[PDB]
């Protein structure tokens, strides 16, 4: 049974450098789960830099709704690069995917489906799930209005970073970045007419995506926070000299200013093995 306080605490204690995502997710998820008569399944699209917390947030959402999180019987993970790797097999993926979603929602109206690597998913396979996302009361005799769909993607990461870098160079705080700043920078790509058309409802004048959730590239200080957590998780005494040396081995961009981690947090943890026995 989801609590707003518990979801907020889990986000605040564990998710670093994502002030926009924390707030959007907290209010979108709590408001939907707490609504006994939703009009449409909650559809979230989480976009942004590699290694900055998209699967991590998904686990936080899942574990706050169901015991076991991603291992709950009611939470379903599709990894497009693992499960849907070959474009020419689209029909075989589509047929299995439609059966799987329909059977599980039949059995559990409050099912959760996560589509990871959506930017590598055949557009025709995305088309196959659009009816489940819409404002229909019944789709082939089953209501999807209590279900939740979460998409994870890198598309838009570079543009989102343009905003973060502009704020950094201007002497502004990261937490001053607003959703409107991100939506404006994405007007030419993720938010252009063809994408808006692609994601449009087939029933009323609305988008199938309820919330765009942007993820910002991580700074050096966020990488240090994650290294400290990994040290504790391994049972090490934290050593700030190792924190700095590990973080210094990571590649940062732009070439001149060294502001953001190329890989977010990814690959950092294997470097601890060169500093600990």
């Amino acid at each position: 049974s989801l609590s707003r306080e518990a979801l907020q605490k889990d986000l605040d204690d564990n998710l670093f450098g994502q002030h926009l995502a924390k707030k959007i997710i907290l209010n979108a998820v709590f408001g939907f789960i707490n609504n006994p008569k939703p009009k449409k399944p909650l559809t979230l699209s989480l976009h942004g830099w590699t290694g900055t917390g998209k699967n991590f947030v998904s686990k936080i959402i899942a574990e706050n709704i169901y015991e076991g999180g991603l291992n709950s019987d009611y939470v379903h993970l599709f990894v497009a690069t693992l499960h849907f790797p070959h474009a020419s097999n689209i029909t075989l993926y589509k047929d299995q995917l439609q059966l799987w979603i329909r059977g599980n929602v039949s059995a559990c109206a409050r099912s959760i489906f996560i589509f990871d690597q959506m930017d590598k998913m055949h557009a025709g396979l995305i088309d196959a799930i659009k009816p489940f996302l819409d404002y229909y009361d019944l789709v082939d005799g089953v209501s999807y209005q209590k279900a939740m769909f979460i998409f994870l993607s890198n598309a838009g990461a570079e543009r989102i970073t343009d905003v973060a870098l502009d704020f950094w160079r201007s002497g502004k705080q990261r937490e001053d970045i607003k959703l409107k700043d991100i939506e404006h920078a994405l007007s030419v790509s993720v938010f252009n007419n063809k994408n808006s058309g692609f994601w449009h409802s087939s029933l009323i004048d609305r988008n199938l995506i309820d919330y765009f959730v942007p993820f910002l590239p991580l700074e050096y200080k966020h990488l240090k926070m994650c290294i400290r957590v990994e040290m504790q998780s391994r049972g090490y005494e934290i050593d700030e000299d190792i924190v700095s040396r590990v973080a210094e081995e990571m590649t940062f961009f732009p070439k001149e200013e060294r502001v953001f981690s190329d890989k977010g947090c990814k690959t950092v943890f294997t470097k601890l093995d060169y500093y600990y026995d």
Partner: nanobody, 123 residues
């Protein structure tokens, strides 16, 4: 239902000649992610020759490129291998293979194999 692959078409071919192998499956093959042909020559381990997805995308081992063509007929539950320009290097037992994979959960492959057909290419 017991689904089985049966290969036919093997035999002796003179060097430079051609041969067509067929595999009939006793059940529907639409849902096989990949079907293909492997070969096992004396004292050697089995190796990929050619493969094809359900949507007809093909690939070939380096040693047969340009000479062999794989094709698939989902409606007739059959896969074929046309072999041209054969040399004694192609002598082997040929096996048809089918692979089925899940769309959720941990990776695995359910594999099916036929009993194989002997191809001998004389010098």
């Amino acid at each position: 239902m017991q689904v089985q692959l049966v290969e036919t078409g093997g035999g002796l071919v003179q060097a430079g000649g051609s041969l067509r192998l067929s595999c009939a499956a006793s059940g529907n093959i639409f849902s096989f992610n990949v079907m293909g042909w492997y070969r096992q020559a004396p004292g050697k381990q089995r190796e990929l020759v050619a493969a094809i997805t359900s949507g007809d995308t093909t690939t070939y081992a380096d040693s047969v490129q340009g000479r062999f063509t794989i094709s698939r007929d989902n409606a007739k539950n059959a896969v074929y291998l046309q072999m041209n320009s054969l040399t004694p290097e192609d002598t082997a037992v040929y096996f048809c293979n089918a692979r089925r994979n899940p769309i959720n959960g941990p990776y695995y492959t359910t594999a099916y194999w036929g009993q194989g057909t002997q191809v001998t290419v004389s010098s």
